[PDB]
Amino acid sequence: IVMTQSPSSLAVSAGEKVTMSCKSSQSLLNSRTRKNYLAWYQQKPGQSPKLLIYWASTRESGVPDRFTGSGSGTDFTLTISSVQAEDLAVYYCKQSNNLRTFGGGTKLEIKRADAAPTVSIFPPSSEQLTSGGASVVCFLNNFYPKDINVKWKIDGSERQNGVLNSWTDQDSKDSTYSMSSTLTLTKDEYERHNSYTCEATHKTSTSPIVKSFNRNE
């Protein structure tokens, strides 16, 4: 049996209703038990999946009213009446009428009001420098939306090589993102220059947020 889910992902604002679909290539209705063998699981980032709905429409112990499973045969749906911040997760349907098969999942994301990042810059530690490396980190905290740009400048000149960027998952409490931008040099590279600057550009303003430091301080 092939399971297919839709959409692959979607974003809604808190308080809004959401509908996700799950289709199977064969009927999941067991004629003997007269039940649809389809389950919905919730998997939050970094966590194991958690059973929400079984037999297509029955809610597992502890799961809130807000989650409703429906459908029969080959077409199934998971409805969330009012999505909240804790709902950030991928939702998987799973047939168990013939062995078991998981759908491809639907990622639920949250839309929220735009928010500017708080920007911090961190010079390299002495223990890294001692080992001959110099990582400079620009941290952008609690912003939205996700897309954001960091420009690095050394002694006033832009620097593109040696930079790595990485985002957090959407925050389960306030729906914001954070990201780090790391410029990695050798100790010698680092000690050849003085001024280190990172500029954060985000839709929350025309002007970039600029943070800097001087190696000789």
């Binding site: 059973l51 079984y54 911090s120 961190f122 530690s125 890294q128 790595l164």
Partner: protein, 221 residues
């Protein structure tokens, strides 16, 4: 209290084999079918197979994708489930979960995986197991943001805790990045300036594949 705990994860060379274990307690083991599920990083869950309960004769079934390559068995005296993996390739790199399946022959029967283990990460690579280096992130107002930069480890994953788990609010941990065969990430925490440096802030960085934990106390410049 139902418990499922997977072990045996880590780095394995391509072509080699690996046995996973899943220790259980808090229920009558022999009453339940037991399933294995895996999940490649950033991908969907995939059911691999199950072994049935005692009433059904502990018979095994598997998905097409792993038929003839993955094998399942159970020690009914110790209540331990196993997954035997053979001829592993990079595509098999994934988190492997065990899950309690149905008990249709005694007690409460409903179709679903009521309990799951925490999962164990297997990565199939010809590379080298290397513990991370941990560096403090400290500034050059009413709040201060600190953290640890974790670099040069392999394979995944690492977990970062603050003050041995006692500092949990305002924690941000960015996803790992792979560059030149090594992983790195950074974890940061924001606390009131009245708490640091006047009080202790420490990050604990655990790297399961090397059985290593590193501590880094955050000190002022």
């Amino acid at each position: 209290e139902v418990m499922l705990v997977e072990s045996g994860g880590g780095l394995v060379q391509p072509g080699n084999s690996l046995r996973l274990s899943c220790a259980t307690s808090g229920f009558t083991f022999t009453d339940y079918y037991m399933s294995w599920v895996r999940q490649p990083p950033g991908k969907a869950l995939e059911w691999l197979g199950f072994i049935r309960n005692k009433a059904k004769g502990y018979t095994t079934e598997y998905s097409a994708s792993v038929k003839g390559r993955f094998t399942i068995s159970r020690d009914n005296s110790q209540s331990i489930l196993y997954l035997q993996m053979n001829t592993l390739r990079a595509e098999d790199s994934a988190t492997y979960y065990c899950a309690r399946d149905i008990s249709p022959s005694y007690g409460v029967y409903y179709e679903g995986f009521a309990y799951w283990g925490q999962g164990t990460l297997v990565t199939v690579s010809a590379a080298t197991t290397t513990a991370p280096s941990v560096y403090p992130l400290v500034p050059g107002g009413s709040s201060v943001t600190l953290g640890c930069l974790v670099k040069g480890y392999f394979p995944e994953p690492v977990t970062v805790k603050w003050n041995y788990g006692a500092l949990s609010s305002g924690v941000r941990t960015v996803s790992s990045v792979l560059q030149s065969g090594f992983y790195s990430l950074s974890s940061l925490v924001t606390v009131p300036s009245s708490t640091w440096p006047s009080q202790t802030v420490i990050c604990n960085v655990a790297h399961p594949a090397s059985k290593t934990e590193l501590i880094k106390r955050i000190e002022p410049r």
